[PDB]
From a paper:
We identified an FtsA-FtsN interaction site in FtsA’s IA-IC interdomain cleft by X-ray crystallography and confirmed that FtsA forms double filaments in vivo by site-specific cysteine cross-linking. The 16 FtsA monomers are organised into four tetramers, each containing two short antiparallel protofilaments comprising two FtsA monomers. One of the two FtsA monomers in each protofilament adopts a closed and the other one an open conformation. The IC domain in the open conformation is rotated downwards by 13.8 ° compared to the closed conformation, as analysed by DynDom38. The IC domains in the lateral interfaces of each tetramer are twisted against each other compared to the straight VmFtsA1-396 double filament. Several hydrogen bonding contacts are lost because of the bending when compared to the straight filament. FtsN and PilN both bind in the IA-IC interdomain cleft (using FtsA domain nomenclature for PilM), but use different binding modes. FtsN binds further downward in the cleft, predominantly contacting the IC domain of FtsA. Importantly, our structural data reveal that the FtsA double filament is compatible with FtsN binding.
During bacterial cell division, filaments of tubulin-like FtsZ form the Z-ring, which is the cytoplasmic scaffold for divisome assembly. In Escherichia coli, actin homologue FtsA anchors the Z-ring to the membrane and recruits divisome components, including bitopic FtsN. In E. coli and many other bacteria, FtsA is the main membrane anchor for the cell division ring, the Z-ring, which initiates and organises division.
Numbering used by the authors: 8 to 389
The structure:
Amino acid sequence: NIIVGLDIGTATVSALVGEVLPDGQVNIIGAGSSPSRGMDKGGVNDLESVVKSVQRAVDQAELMAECQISSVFISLSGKHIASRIEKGMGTISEEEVSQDDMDRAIHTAKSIKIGDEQRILHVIPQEFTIDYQEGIKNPLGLSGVRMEVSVHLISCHNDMARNIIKAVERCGLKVEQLVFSGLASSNAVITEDERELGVCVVDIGAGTMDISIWTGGALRHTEVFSYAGNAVTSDIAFAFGTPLSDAEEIKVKYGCALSELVSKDDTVNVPSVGGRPSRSLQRQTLAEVIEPRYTELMGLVNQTIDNVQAKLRENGVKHHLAAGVVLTGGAAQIEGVVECAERVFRNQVRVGKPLEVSGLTDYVKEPYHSTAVGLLHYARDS
Ligand SMILES: Nc1ncnc2c1ncn2[C@@H]1O[C@H](COP(=O)(O)OP(=O)(O)OP(=O)(O)O)[C@@H](O)[C@H]1O
Ligand SMILES: [Mg+2]
């Protein structure tokens, strides 16, 4: 009937509500945003401050939709998120692969020993195989005698998840499921065509770099880094002697990811501390600090793609991501990301926004909303 998201981000908390229409298309009924205090690297850092932030967005969203919120789908990220790939097996009773046969094979590959510190988050079947026929998708009706699956397992640190759950539960809400941020950030920015050719998505944000790699129409790997937009924000402050509050504004209003797209005759007013006059500083100099960090950040994604690409072809599956890299999130909005990305990467870079948003489209237009609407796409499926 009604579905609710909750992207508890490192900087802003987004909360969307929508209703499932009979055909399937979900239209958004109400949005909600609020700055988040007490957050760092996608994890909880001050429990009482994030609880107030979650209530700020959930109350304004319950009001913009004329309905009471009771259950939510929440996102989750952090360096602790890890991915595993495990194979399984199963018999095909009465030579027809019924759905009861399909979950048994998944159950076998899913049942492993991980420990208590690890919490299972996603079990994503990649490519099936049915008697010398490999790489089949949805074989619901293929006559065979036995089948093996290659499930993709997403796991996260359990304790860091309990904190996020505790925050939402203290507002009278019930959590439905935890969702990896980059997975939702990919479900709402990608077209099915791009998935099959091969793509790399990255939720560039305040404190998290949520990477998801897709080849052959299946999620292959997921990795997260803790250096994000808050790193370049600090670099501006620490290099010019300007307060963090002011250094953020200079980043959003005059920041450039390449120190050659800005003209020498451009200047910015960077303030000072102590009671000093605000100096007028070259706009090129500002971009000269943002450029090295973005290159290093994308260098981590490049090193991740290469390590996944190597171990991918070495096992016999689609390895080269054709559609390229898709950038999203807040810190992907700076002028010149596609230019500095195309230098460190050598694949198709774009700054994809949420797609096919229905109704109330003015609040789900910018890429920093992708993770939020992606929670709706995931919740739409059951
Ligand atoms: N125009 C802009 N140019 C450069 N950076 C920007 C711009 N607008 C926003 N940002 C950066 O985007 C970041 C916020 O990202 P975003 O809102 O997507 O994160 P979030 O949802 O709060 O959390 P998460 O860390 O989990 O992605 C901030 O670090 C901010 O500096
Ligand atoms: Mg986010």
